[PDB]
Design a binder for this molecule. Structure first.
Ligand SMILES: [Mg+2]
Lengths: 267, 402, 298, 248, 299
């Protein structure tokens, strides 16, 4: 298939990016350091809310470092106009790039949260390995989905721009907006109104931010206190179950990939 | 040292009640008989500068309306203005003016003594080390001291091992210590006002006492100092603008940066509904003093709210209701009085400043501003501090500012 | 018949960047498009590659539609400026293009040795020169028996030994039964190996046909320098007879000029009388032909 | 003088940089938003403006001049400019004049609207103290920015490609702002028996952001040595940049 | 006066000498072609004419003095290969910047912007310029003032050939005034009508220097004769290949003939008189054939 032949390229081109392997080992050396400090401080809902915040700062960062130059990095490089004269479509050289860069994020977090599990099963003696596998299996199959959102976000801002220097400005803009501006816009809306803006609309604004849907999935069972959560404490007022929060994370992929394909179809 | 019968008292009523006319007098005087003597406002009983001016040794003496001046200063021989013996039970010292460099009201071994409505101007030139006590109480059970005005004494109202007594509505101005407590188990004090004092309330090693409604306006370096108090009750105190300074003698306390409340080894006590306003430190919680009911206070305007140099967690809300904090940037969705997120008053970088004062030079750095944000994002590095779930959203002490 | 563009007038935004070109192409010819670096030539380049839809007219690449998958396996496109993938190697990039087009994987060895690139294979493309990337850019164009090449300025940034050998590589393909389109701008030197030039200006295809058909239909003067003859004075007297200009340089070096209406009987006097040393006969080349058709079109 | 003829280029090229004008607008917006929450809610707000200008004025300087030398080498104009009547000193010092007046203007839009938001929202601010505490603020924020301007010329002349210049300009910004003070704290909280904390007020002089904050907090040294230590960070790193630029 | 007198320099990097024993000499009005490969052979000699390097064992006398003086570089243009200018500046402000540096008056900018043909596209950004448009810009900065020496490192790359003839018309406008230039190009057909003396050099050394008359006279090369519009080689090719001079059978009605130009050159010349083709081009051995000979003379 042609979708795998261009996925096999990006799997062998993203792993030669030295900027990736710095901040994917940085994701590994922090997930071991948090899980060792989370074992020495024994608590359990604080080492989940800090790992989910760690993958909020880094799994969008590895996704936007990968795929900001996926379309516009090939257009000004000359090899995009060449690729359309091969037996391909515009839907196959995008879904192939999504599969190709998606397996990197599936490996950048299996390295990261993989050594976090061996820095817990070999550190806290007598821990329940069944409870460890379920919670950190939920970290693995949902930090990929957070990564695949920002992978599909980066294809939107690559097809729209026509210069890679402006794609790096937009990729820095999307990383600042969804991670630590939307968490601060929602905080400043709650502080300045003292929680009296809307007592029913404001928990539903967490679903307009995929980093907050990511934090709400991993903090489902280990809720605990509220000040470790901060603005994620509004998710207790969300009446949706945990399974719908998976589907709103997948709907952030499929809407922003069909938007990524409809932009690229009129490139 | 003459006697009270050696004066010229004009008797108004023949029920051991006397009335001294207007005119100055001289020397010490001693009460040995139960005489309920009053005085005209021009009765300036001025001593010469030695001895206790009005010694009382008989029970049921209603001293009223005197004006005392310039007694002794030998604090070892207790040169007081009104000396009250242990045999002088149920003495009333009502509406008196005193001016002299020693003890104002020295009582010891007494029961049901009433020191009401007096004005005790201590000194002007002495270095607040030999001025003598304003209202000294030494192991009295039953006393009732109300609405006096002590000014410029040494360590204010000293109380030593006195069990049951009330201190209601008395104003204490420009003294070293406001109210001093030494081993006074089962005490009580209501609505007192302490102004411009090197320690507003010294509460040292006294259990089971009630500190309620008291006011501390612009005192120095220690608002309410509690040392080793157990099963106490701190309800409604207003501690305002504790600036830095020093006591000048450094005997039992040290110099401070300005603390509205300093808890030293006090294990169990209820600290509710207070108001700690505009000091440098709102409350200092030592490492020995844990697990006590601290809920409902108002920590407004302080440059640093809690100082807690420990790593043990400390919940500050009994029955689910916490304190109002001025720098609490929280919200209230469900319209109750409580906030929705908990409030940690201390960071990790807020406790490096206490351990190492050289971090004050680094306090404006972006890395410190990074480190303030890394604690809010990664709660594993947050040391367990002095948080309170459900803090208050509005001021609970709307009446204490009056 | 490889490329039969007929009646195509490509427009967008009512700019009408292409205008009614009727461009056939043989099964073995080497066509050359010689427009500007503007929307005249590069829009016609996109229609043959099939990445543009032909408004008002059809394009039949290899007798089929130009966007079908079964024709794009038989095409080869060398784009203008391709820094390909600077972290990948030389072999792995060409292997990646091999699995895309469906070419057999054994071609990747014998194309990186055919083109002079085996010394720099298994090395990263950021450590390539601009001439070495065009060598890779040709190596993906020859991938898996291409029955229609389409090169777009393949000899720019390239050595004179290499572009002589590249035209030997082109003549290997012309006998092998493919068609090559040379979108170029380096017109002195390319006129030996093309079969039909296609000069187009401002959208309209101005002139097409072979080099003999271009020089005959557009009257262009043939310049001839004859240096080192025995004498000039009785030979300028010989050439102040037919009404054409002449200028000597050193001893007898008259650079006379025929309008291709007198040149056949001109040379018949030169051999039969005189001892000429250096005679150079320039036919009207591609560039002055291109400097006529652009001039005639305004 | 040709030190100004190449400075007029960098004014005209720097003011059309889309990356700078995004950050310089964001610097001026956040300087109002700190001044908004410092008046409605003066050493507490001039320190919070100092923490803002320690984040962004190194970032503004490193966005301007990471491609000053190597950005002209990749463009080929650096090889062209050396064949002109121009020394290598006049290209570097002329770029330092041209890029220097850019962030000397970015604090006049940055703090010119921040001091406007303080002088018109306090109503009784006693402006004789304002124009001396902000005059010391706008001058010292340019001198902090001129250090990282001269730091950017050091890393531009050393590298050979523009992609590795941004990898060092991000690396110098990380190391000199928030890694050097984190290893100062790590020398405190992890070493206590052989680390005298009285030496630590002197170790702030090896960091130009630390010397920047000390003249906004007014300390074993006086103020006038820190001005001569901030100017020494310009004069050594420009001399280091000129020694690197003469070895291309 | 000789403009460039490279008096036997030998520029080395370590122990290896990338340019060995180069002895060039440019006249006062000549047009020299520094032909060679793209690597360190030509581009080290091109820096020695400028002030960018120093000779390791020789000296260069650019206009009779040292190359790194300010008196030289005010009258010395240089267009480099693959130049991309400041992409946020305009076309006019880039030339107004380069005129202020070289000491030329600002009245010459608007003249040169129409002279190279940029007045339609002046005051637009350099990022929205084509490859040939920056070549027109980079040529225009070389003409600032009255430059006695130009080093046009590939001036013709990316230009439409109606403008390259305008470019060589600018050369003949320049070299009549006495401004000797240096070509460092690669499109070798075309440049031979304006090069006064080529200076082809190999990897290390310098191979050949002289005029196009002197190059073909020493380097004995076959003369190329092409014809068209005439029947196949069976009537032709068995007249020369049996007679010791080749005939490269090209495509149909395009077969070209080569011979060693001795006594057999006239035997080609009597062919087309009797067996008349049309479009019968006969060229001297070009710069391309001279390049392919001398490169194989040194490796
Ligand atoms: Mg609530």
């Amino acid at each position: 298939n042609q979708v795998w032949n261009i996925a096999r390229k990006e799997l062998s081109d993203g792993l030669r990016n030295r900027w990736l392997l710095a901040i994917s080992l940085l994701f590994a050396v922090l997930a071991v350091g948090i899980a060792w400090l989370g074992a020495a401080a024994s608590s359990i809902p604080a080492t989940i809310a800090s790992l989910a915040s760690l993958a909020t700062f880094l799994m969008p960062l590895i996704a936007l470092l990968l795929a900001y130059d996926a379309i516009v990095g090939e257009d000004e490089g000359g090899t995009l106009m060449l690729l359309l004269t091969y037996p391909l479509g515009r839907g196959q050289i995008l879904l192939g790039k999504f599969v190709g860069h998606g397996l990197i994020l599936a490996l950048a977090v299996l390295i990261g949260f993989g050594c976090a599990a061996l820095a817990i099963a070999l550190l806290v003696e007598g821990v329940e390995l069944g409870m460890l596998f379920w919670a950190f299996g939920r970290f693995m199959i949902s930090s990929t989905l957070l990564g695949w959102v920002f992978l599909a976000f980066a294809y939107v801002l690559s097809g729209k721009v026509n210069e890679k220097s402006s794609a790096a400005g937009l990729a820095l803009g999307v990383w600042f907006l969804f991670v630590l501006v939307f968490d601060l816009v929602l905080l400043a809306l709650l502080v300045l109104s003292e929680g009296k803006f809307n007592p029913e609309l404001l928990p539903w604004l967490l679903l307009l931010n995929p980093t907050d849907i990511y934090r709400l999935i991993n903090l489902s069972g280990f809720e605990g206190s509220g000040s470790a959560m901060g603005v994620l404490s509004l998710g207790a007022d969300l009446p949706v179950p945990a399974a719908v929060l998976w589907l709103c994370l997948l709907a952030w992929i499929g809407v922003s990939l069909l938007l990524a394909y409809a932009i690229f179809r009129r490139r | 040292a003459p006697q009270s019968i050696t004066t010229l008292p004009l008797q108004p009523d023949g029920e051991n009640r006397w009335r001294l006319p207007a005119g100055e007098y001289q020397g010490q005087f001693t009460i040995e008989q139960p005489m309920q003597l009053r005085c005209e406002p021009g009765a300036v009983i001025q001593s010469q500068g030695q001895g206790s001016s009005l010694l009382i040794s008989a029970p049921d003496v209603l001293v009223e309306g005197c004006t005392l001046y310039e007694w002794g200063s030998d604090l070892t021989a207790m040169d007081s203005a009104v000396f009250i013996l242990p045999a002088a039970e149920r003495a009333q010292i009502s509406n008196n003016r005193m001016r002299g460099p020693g003890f104002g009201v020295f009582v010891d071994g007494t029961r049901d003594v009433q020191v009401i409505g007096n004005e005790i101007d201590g000194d002007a030139g002495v270095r607040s080390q030999d001025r003598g006590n304003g209202i000294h109480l030494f192991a009295v059970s039953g006393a009732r001291v109300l609405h006096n005005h002590v000014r410029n004494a040494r360590d204010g109202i000293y109380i030593d091992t006195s069990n049951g007594n009330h201190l209601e509505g008395n104003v204490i101005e420009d003294v070293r210590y406001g109210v001093h407590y030494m081993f006074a188990n089962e005490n009580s004090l209501i609505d007192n006002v302490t102004r411009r004092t090197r320690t507003g309330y010294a509460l040292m090693q006294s259990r089971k006492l009630t500190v309620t409604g008291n006011r501390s306006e612009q005192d120095q370096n220690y608002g309410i100092l509690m040392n080793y108090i157990t099963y106490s009750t701190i309800t409604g105190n207003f501690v305002s603008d504790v600036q830095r300074g020093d006591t000048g003698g450094d005997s039992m306390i040290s110099g401070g940066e300005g603390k509205a409340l300093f808890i030293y080894n006090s294990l169990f006590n209820t600290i509710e509904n207070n108001h700690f306003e505009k000091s440098s430190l709102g409350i200092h919680l030592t490492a020995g003093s844990e697990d006590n009911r601290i809920s409902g206070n108002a920590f407004v305007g302080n440059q640093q709210q809690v100082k807690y140099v420990a790593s043990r967690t400390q919940e500050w809300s009994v029955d689910g209701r916490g304190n109002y904090w001025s720098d609490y940037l929280g919200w209230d969705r469900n319209n109750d009085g409580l906030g929705d997120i908990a409030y940690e008053p201390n960071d990790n970088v807020d406790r490096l400043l206490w351990l190492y004062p050289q971090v004050r030079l680094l306090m404006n750095s972006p890395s410190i501003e990074v480190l303030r944000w890394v604690q809010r994002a990664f709660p594993v590095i947050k040391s367990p501090g002095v948080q309170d779930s459900h803090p208050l959203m509005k001021l609970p002490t709307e009446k204490l500012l009056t | 018949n490889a490329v039969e563009i007929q009646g195509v007038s490509q427009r967008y935004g009512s700019m009408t960047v292409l205008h009614d070109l009727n461009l056939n192409l043989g099964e073995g010819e080497v066509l050359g498009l010689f427009g500007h670096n503007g929307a005249g030539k590069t829009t016609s380049m996109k229609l043959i590659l099939g990445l543009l839809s032909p408004s008002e007219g059809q394009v039949k690449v290899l007798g089929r539609a130009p966007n079908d998958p079964q024709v794009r396996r038989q095409l080869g496109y060398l784009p203008e400026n391709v820094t390909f993938y600077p972290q990948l190697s030389g072999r792995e990039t060409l292997r990646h293009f091999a699995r895309l087009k469906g070419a057999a994987l054994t071609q990747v060895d014998e194309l990186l040795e055919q083109v002079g690139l085996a010394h720099a294979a298994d090395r990263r493309v950021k450590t390539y020169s601009k001439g070495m990337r065009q060598r890779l850019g040709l190596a993906q164009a020859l991938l898996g028996e291409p029955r229609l090449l389409l090169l777009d300025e393949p000899t720019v940034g390239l050595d004179p030994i290499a572009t002589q050998d590249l035209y030997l590589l082109i003549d290997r393909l012309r006998q092998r039964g493919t068609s090559i389109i040379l979108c170029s701008h380096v017109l002195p030197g390319v006129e030996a190996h093309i079969n039909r030039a296609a000069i187009l200006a401002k959208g309209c295809l101005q002139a097409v046909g072979s080099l003999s058909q271009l020089r005959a239909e557009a009257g262009l003067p043939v310049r001839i320098r004859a240096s080192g003859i025995s004498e000039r004075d009785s030979w300028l007297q010989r050439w102040t007879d037919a009404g054409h200009s002449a200028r000597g340089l050193s001893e007898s070096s008259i650079e006379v000029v025929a309008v291709n209406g007198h040149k056949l009987v001109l040379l018949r006097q030169l051999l039969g009388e005189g001892e000429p040393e250096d005679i150079e006969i320039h036919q009207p080349s591609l560039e002055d032909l291109y400097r006529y058709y652009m001039e005639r079109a305004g």
